[PDB]
Write a protein that binds this DNA or RNA. Structure first.
Ligand SMILES: Nc1ncnc2c1ncn2[C@H]1CC[C@@H](COP(=O)(O)OP(=O)(O)OP(=O)(O)O)O1
Ligand SMILES: [Ca+2]
Ligand SMILES: [Ca+2]
Length: 348
DNA sequence: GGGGGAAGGATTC
DNA sequence: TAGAATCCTTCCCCC
C-alpha cells in the first residue's frame, strides 16, 4: 500500500489571507470569541508568522495579545473555510477514488493503483500541491508512506508547504527512534502512562508484557502501538461518516437555575437543527460543562426521528436529570444529536 | 470548540 | 485461550 496524505497549511488563517491578500506577511490569529468579557475566548489557529512567537491554537486570546498586540485578530468563519475545503476535497477525488476525508483540512488518498513506487508517489504529491495552489491559492503539506499513520507523520515533519516520503527503511528507523509521544493518538495522558511503564519508543511495546501495557493504556491503544512497532499496521482508506452534530454554548454566568439555562440550551438546539440539514437524529444528548470544566452528559434514544419540538421537551428533562445527579454549577450548556435515520455510521 | 472512538460499568442473553 | 454483545457515560485525542 502507498498512502498520500494532504494537510492544508494553517488552514483557517490561510483562507482569510486568500480572501484578503493584504494579510500576507502579517501575523494572523483566527479566534473564537466566547462573549463572557473583552477578548474572552481562545485562538482557533494562527499563521506561521504568529505561531513563530508562540501564538497557537488553544491559548487564550488575552494571552495572544500580550505576545503580539499588533497581530490581526479575526473571528472564525467556519462556514467560509468549509466551502473552500469542499472545493479542494473535490479536486483530490480526481487523483484517487479511495479517499478518506479526516477533517476540514486533512485527507488520505490510497494511490496504490495509481503509482508504482515512492518516486512516482513524490511526483504525484508535487502535482497535487501545484494543482491546489493554482485552483485555490492554498499551500498544503504532503506526507507519503506505506500506511496512514506514517503518511501523517511525514506531513508532521515536513509542514508547512512541504512534502516528505518515509520509505520502508525510515519506517523501521522511526520504530526504533521516534518518541512514542509523536505517534498519532498518543496525547499527554497516554505519553505519561507510557513513560511510567518505561516505554519511550514504539519498539519498546514489543518487549513489555501485553497485560501490563493493556492495563495501563487500554486494549485498543496497546494493540495499535504494537501493530505499528511490528510494521504490520494496515488500516484501509475508508469514507468517514458524520455520526453526531451538536453545539455547546457558553453562558454569561455559572448557573443551576433551569429558567436561566433554558435560553442557552434552546439556542444550541436551534443551531444544531440548522446544522443537521436533512439528517434526522433518533438520539439526543444534553451536555453540560461544569464550572471546573468537567463534562456531564445525559441522553435518550427514540425508536423514531426527533422533531425540533420533541428535542425542546426532551432536552429540559435531560438537563433536569443532570442538575439532580451533579451538584456543581454549569458554565456551558449544549446538545448533541446522533443515530441518524438511514444507514451505516451516522450515529452515536 | 466540535466531534470520533475507546474505556469501563451495567444489563441481558 | 475464554463470557460476551450491547448500551450508556466518561475519558482521551485531535483538528
Ligand atoms: N481551542 C480550539 N478552538 C477551536 N478550534 C480549535 C481549537 N484547538 C484546535 N482547533 C482546531 C482548529 C484548527 C486546528 C489546529 O490544528 P493544526 O495546527 O493541526 O491545523 P492548522 O491550523 O491547519 O495548522 P497546521 O496543520 O499547518 O499545523 O484544530
Ligand atoms: Ca493543517
Ligand atoms: Ca502527542
Amino acid at each position: 500500500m502507498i498512502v498520500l496524505f494532504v494537510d492544508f497549511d494553517y488552514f483557517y488563517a490561510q483562507v482569510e489571507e486568500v480572501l484578503n491578500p493584504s494579510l500576507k506577511g502579517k501575523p494572523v490569529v483566527v479566534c473564537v470569541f466566547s462573549g463572557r468579557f473583552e477578548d474572552s475566548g481562545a485562538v482557533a489557529t494562527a499563521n506561521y508568522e504568529a505561531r513563530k512567537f508562540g501564538v497557537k491554537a488553544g491559548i487564550p486570546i488575552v494571552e495572544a495579545k500580550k505576545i503580539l498586540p499588533n497581530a490581526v485578530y479575526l473571528p472564525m468563519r467556519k462556514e467560509v473555510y468549509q466551502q473552500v475545503s469542499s472545493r479542494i476535497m473535490n479536486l483530490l477525488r480526481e487523483y484517487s477514488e479511495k479517499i478518506e476525508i479526516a477533517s476540514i483540512d486533512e485527507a488520505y488518498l490510497d494511490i496504490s493503483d495509481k503509482v508504482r513506487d515512492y518516486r512516482e508517489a513524490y511526483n504525484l504529491g508535487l502535482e497535487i500541491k501545484n494543482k491546489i495552489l493554482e485552483k485555490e491559492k492554498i499551500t498544503v503539506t504532503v506526507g507519503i508512506s506505506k500506511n496512514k499513520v506514517f503518511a501523517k507523520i511525514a506531513a508532521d515533519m515536513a509542514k508547512p508547504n512541504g512534502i516528505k516520503v518515509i520509505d520502508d527503511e525510515e519506517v523501521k528507523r522511526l520504530i526504533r527512534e521516534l518518541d512514542i509521544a509523536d505517534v498519532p493518538g498518543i496525547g499527554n495522558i497516554t505519553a505519561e502512562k507510557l513513560k511510567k511503564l518505561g516505554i519511550n519508543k514504539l519498539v519498546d511495546t514489543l518487549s513489555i508484557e501485553f497485560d501490563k501495557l493493556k492495563g495501563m493504556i487500554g486494549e485498543a491503544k496497546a494493540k495499535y502501538l504494537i501493530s505499528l512497532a511490528r510494521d504490520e499496521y494496515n488500516e484501509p482508506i475508508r469514507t468517514r461518516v458524520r455520526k453526531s452534530i451538536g453545539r455547546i454554548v457558553t453562558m454569561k454566568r455559572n448557573s443551576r437555575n433551569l429558567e436561566e439555562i433554558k435560553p442557552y440550551l434552546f439556542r444550541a438546539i436551534e443551531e444544531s437543527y440548522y446544522k443537521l440539514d436533512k439528517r434526522i437524529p433518533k438520539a439526543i444528548h444534553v451536555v453540560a460543562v461544569t464550572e471546573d470544566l468537567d463534562i456531564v452528559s445525559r441522553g435518550r434514544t427514540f425508536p423514531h426521528g426527533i422533531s425540533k419540538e420533541t428535542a425542546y421537551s426532551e432536552s429540559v428533562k435531560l438537563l433536569q436529570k443532570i442538575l439532580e445527579e451533579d451538584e456543581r454549577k454549569i458554565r456551558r450548556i449544549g446538545v448533541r444529536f446522533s443515530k441518524f435515520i438511514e444507514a451505516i455510521g451516522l450515529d452515536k
